[PDB]
Every structure is written in C-alpha cells, then in structure tokens.
Amino acid sequence: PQITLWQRPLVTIKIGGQLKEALLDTGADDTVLEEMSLPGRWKPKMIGGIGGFIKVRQYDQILIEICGHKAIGTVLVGPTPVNIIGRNLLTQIGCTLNF
Amino acid sequence: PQITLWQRPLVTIKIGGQLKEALLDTGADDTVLEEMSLPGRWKPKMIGGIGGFIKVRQYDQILIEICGHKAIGTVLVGPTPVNIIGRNLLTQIGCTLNF
Ligand SMILES: *[C]C(*)(*)(*)([C@@](*)(*)*)C(*)(*)([C](*)C(*)(*)(O*)C(*)(*)([N@](*)(*)C(*)(*)(*)(=O(*)*)[C@](*)(*)*)C(*)(*)(*)C1(*)(*)[C](*)[C](*)[C][C](*)[C]1*)C(*)(*)(*)(=O(*)*)[N@@](*)(*)[C@@](*)([C](*)[C]C([N])=O)C(=O)[N][C]([C][C][C][N]C([N])=[N])C([N])=O
Secondary structure, X not given: OEEEOOOOOEEEXXXXXXXXXXXXXXXXXOOEEEOOOOOOOOEEEEEEOOOOEEEEEXXXXXXXXXXXXXXXXXXXXXXXXXXXXXXXXXXXXXXEEEO | OXXXXXXXXXXXXXXXXXXXXXXXXXXXXOOEEOXXXXXXXXXXXXXXXXOOEEEEEEEEEEEEEEOOEEEXXXXXXXXXXXXXXOXXXXXXXXXEEEO
C-alpha cells in the first residue's frame, strides 16, 4: 500500500481480539491507543505531545495486526484523542516516507 | 527521497529567510512551527494534539522550502515542542506513506 496524504492515513488494526482504526503517525515515536481492555501487566509512563503531557499505561510485547501485517511491541494505552501507530511499530511493518 | 523510520524523519526547511529543522509528520493535519519571526497578518487559532490544546497564530500564503522543494501554504506558529510539517504541505512536495 502506497498511502497518499490528502486524507488522514487511517488503517484497520486488530488488537486484543478487537477491531480498531488507527492513524499512522510518523511524528509519534510510540504507539498510543485510546483507553482499552488489555490482558496483562503494565507500568505507569508519561508521554508528551503538542498539548502537553499525558499519563498512559505501558504494555510490552503486545501483538497488533496493522493493515493485515503482524508486529509485537510496546503499546501505550491512555487519554489520546485518536489511536496512533507510531515509529516503534511502523518500522516493523516496513513503512517508509517517500517524496 | 525515501525515508526510513528508525530515526525521527527530520528535514531542513528555509522559512522566512531562516533555516530550521522540522519533523515530517502524517498525524499532523497542519504545519506548526515554534515561535519565530514571520512577516504578515495572522489570525488567532487553536489546535489540539496529545495532552491538550494550544493557541496559535495562523499565517496564510507563507512560502516554505522543504529539502529544496518550494511549497506555499498556511503555517501555524505557537508553542509546539518541535517544528511539525503536516499534511497541508506534505501533499505539496508529493509525499507518501509506503509499506
Ligand atoms: C512529534 C509530534 C509532537 C507528534 C504529533 C502528532 O502527530 C499528533 N498530531 C497533532 O498534534 C496535530 C497526533 C494526534 C493526531 C490526531 C489528534 C491527536 C494527536 C506527537 O505529539 N508525538 C508524541 C506521541 C508519540 C509518543 N508518545 O511516542 C511523541 O512522540 N511524544 C514524545 C515526546 C517528543 C519530544 N521530543 C523531544 N523534545 N526530545 C514522548 N516521549 O512522549
């Protein structure tokens, strides 16, 4: 998939038995998904963005299928407005910018 | 060019006769630069990102060079922690997301 940027690059992901839509964000180092039910252990972490800082729970090694591709990594669950797939998973599915 | 996501996608821009580095960001609908000296009339505006909302100054018809590519668009200037090039200019230098 070559995705053009006239529309938000939004993709289907499958995480925790759940179907979600997530924004692909090259400006996000990490993956932060809207508040949700996930099995396991997690650690308190704080991340920053344009508005300021948020408190998120960090889950390591969670399986995500992103546009039909699989990846395992740290997933952060928290008060984000949209689900964001960031560069930690995006390098895992071979994703590059091109111009 | 083809940019991998192992490191932040940072680029050199010349905006208003000044050289700066900015992040290529697909989760950014707009372009927002740290406070700088830009000539012109601007409208007040507010954007939201991850830990909230910021108040920016909107400048329309700003000329900006990204890697030698010239582009003319709207640029929001305000307290962003990093210079961000969003999809309003990314579609102008023809940039895509491939995976
Ligand atoms: C880079 C930038 C800042 C980004 C941004 C994004 O893109 C957003 N957008 C806006 O804002 C426009 C996203 C979303 C979209 C939709 C709506 C909501 C929002 C960011 O912010 N990023 C962040 C996230 C990721 C993670 N967390 O990982 C980040 O990256 N953060 C970080 C910090 C940075 C800074 N750096 C230095 N300064 N060094 C953390 N760590 O957290």
